[PDB]
Symmetry: D3
Subunit: 156 residues, 6 copies
């Protein structure tokens, strides 16, 4: 059996982009993930509109509403929530997404790159996650038998 | 005629501390807020012990379990959720998300000198309303309503 | 000793308007209802603009987004959900359903001249209690309880 | 992969019945719906009791409780919520069902017959739905990748 | 400054009855509890009829449907959920679980002579706080907080 | 299609143990249960720690937190909630679990051993369950089409 995820991961900084690629690749290799039917936000831009070359839409309340609703709906309609957390950039963005997944009854799984695993994560991130793994365990993670654990590191 | 709040605000950066003081002072002046009976996270850290003062507790799971639970309980047992949002720079998203799931009015307060700046799409969407810090003292928390942030999203 | 409500009632048909006036007048007389601080949808339409008065806004998504959110926020931030139910004839089911999910007491009020008539199975099942309009002025909203509608279902 | 739905659709008026048949047929043809394991209310009458030739049961609080609980349980235990909405008959009945599906974290999908698509829907229906499609798009709808959109028409 | 509760306590065993009386008397003395407007299950049995007094109703589904719904409505429309827990010996777990899902502060009260004894893991985990019976009269229900039971789990 | 359950069942008394075995066996034989990917608590002890030969951990708040969170997470991440209810031992333990499953939108199914079926169950158990069956119907129970019914017996 397989499972679909919401790809909670930012694409705005060097280290976010590096973590993104690594997590994408992690999931292609994992036989318990159905990546084709997962929700990856960048593949699901509203009406194909690219905010980077069309930033006028950042002032458009309809676009904002559509995008927001689509991401939520992406969390709500998939099995597992995936949070690529960058401890140094204090995991900024996915807080709300992680919180919404918890409210919808999803397994919330934080993945941290190995270079950063062990660094201090926020109390709320530690508390909201059902498990926190290294990037390199993500490929061999069994999403059919997801269990609870604590992060082995500091919590600020 | 008096609502209680959860004081969702950080205390690490200079900006954070300055917004923290302004908002707390605002809440004291608001006759529709009952601050004595509100939850302020700094005063409710497990065993009355602040991580920043005793970093010992960075690696203590009883402390982190207890403090996390105390903060959730502070959101759920109070009427309104307040988020002091500094757009240029938290842990706030999960607090905001938890409030939303618990049926609370979610109010973001942004310092006057930052109001207008782009806030994150999820912050924008999870909030019921978004105000300036100089408005917090007069906000009627007995008639809380939806409104859109006067600013863009990123 | 004072609860606030969400005033779930339509204002299109003659019957709807008549039940609307009767119920509002009842709520004014009820000393356990705090009507000043209750949410009445007609007074909280986005930009203070009523669709029926300015149908322009039928095709405005900002307006519909904002007004929908305002009504949800009116249900979730108030104590009780009130549904003025006209059995012979809304949008009320979703309001009722949202209240149920938010943990609110769901009270249906049916005009005396219609009380006894069949209500829909889902209306029947989602409601915590079902009363006559002439009872609304004296209902104790501080001790709200479950009871079955004295009537059939369809 | 396939998905199960709750068949939110009334059977009481001419145009409801016509929309019912069209939606049933839509789903048999859609390869992403598992219609055998979906919940269709009329197939799930309590103890096989036909209210039309046995209306005495409309005064029976036990029957009412059973039926109500079964429909909810039908929404709760399937993947997607399906609402056949008749704009002219102001979609009366499914409001509560749509609201309950939203509370259980389901994709809520309104289908309107093409003859009526574009006519004014209620604010709450517009707001509660994750998408609103024409009857003829229902057969080719991909329930494995359900996304958000707005209704292209009036909202009253 | 006054919160209402749901009085989650059994009345079958001797111990249950003794804890029932102690807790009710405690709640009367607590100036932060509004007991008149609280839900006490024994006083809200369907048709004012107690199963133990009229076991006739053991086999009545209208009665069981109505009483179950009334108890859920008593949890959801009140501020705090109270569980009188007798560790040596309910139906209480589902009441506790329902409160948790409804966003209520969950307080367990254990008789002084039993406090220290092992409570079930799920009781331990679902509760926001766990106190002695002799503390109930002075508990500040306006500032309810998380704390760990001073005792083991089984 | 198959479904995963949470095995809500105690292992502390003679009659609980007998009911446990019977329910385990019931599920191996049921083709609509995927028992390999279900959550059975005893197979999911935190860090393999056996409380019976290591009861020091009963005073360990971290172990308690881990275990509790794992069981919840077991309910939340499976399809159906299964409650092996012993009417005589007044079904003590699963109340919270049953309540949590109801809050997460799960079908809650009580199974009672045939010897005890008909005996008085608690109001809350009766009210929280979507159905109550005999142990011997559990093998032939179709979890792909779970429906509502009342318990045929006393409710105290």
């Amino acid at each position: 059996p397989k499972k679909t995820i919401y790809f909670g991961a930012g694409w705005r900084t060097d280290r976010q982009n590096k973590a993104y690629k690594e997590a994408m690749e992690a999931l292609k290799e994992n036989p318990t993930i159905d990546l084709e039917n997962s929700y990856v936000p960048l593949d699901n831009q509203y009406k194909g509109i690219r905010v980077d070359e069309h930033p006028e839409y950042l002032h458009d309340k309809v676009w904002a509403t559509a995008t927001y609703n689509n991401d939520l709906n992406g969390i709500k309609t998939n099995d597992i929530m995936l949070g690529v957390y960058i401890p140094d950039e204090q995991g900024t963005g996915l807080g709300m997404e992680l919180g919404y997944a918890l409210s919808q009854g999803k397994y919330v799984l934080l993945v941290i790159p190995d270079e950063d695993y062990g660094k201090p994560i926020s109390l709320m991130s530690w508390g909201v996650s059902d498990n926190v793994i290294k990037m390199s365990q993500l490929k061999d993670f069994n999403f059919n038998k997801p269990r609870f654990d604590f992060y082995e590191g500091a919590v600020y």
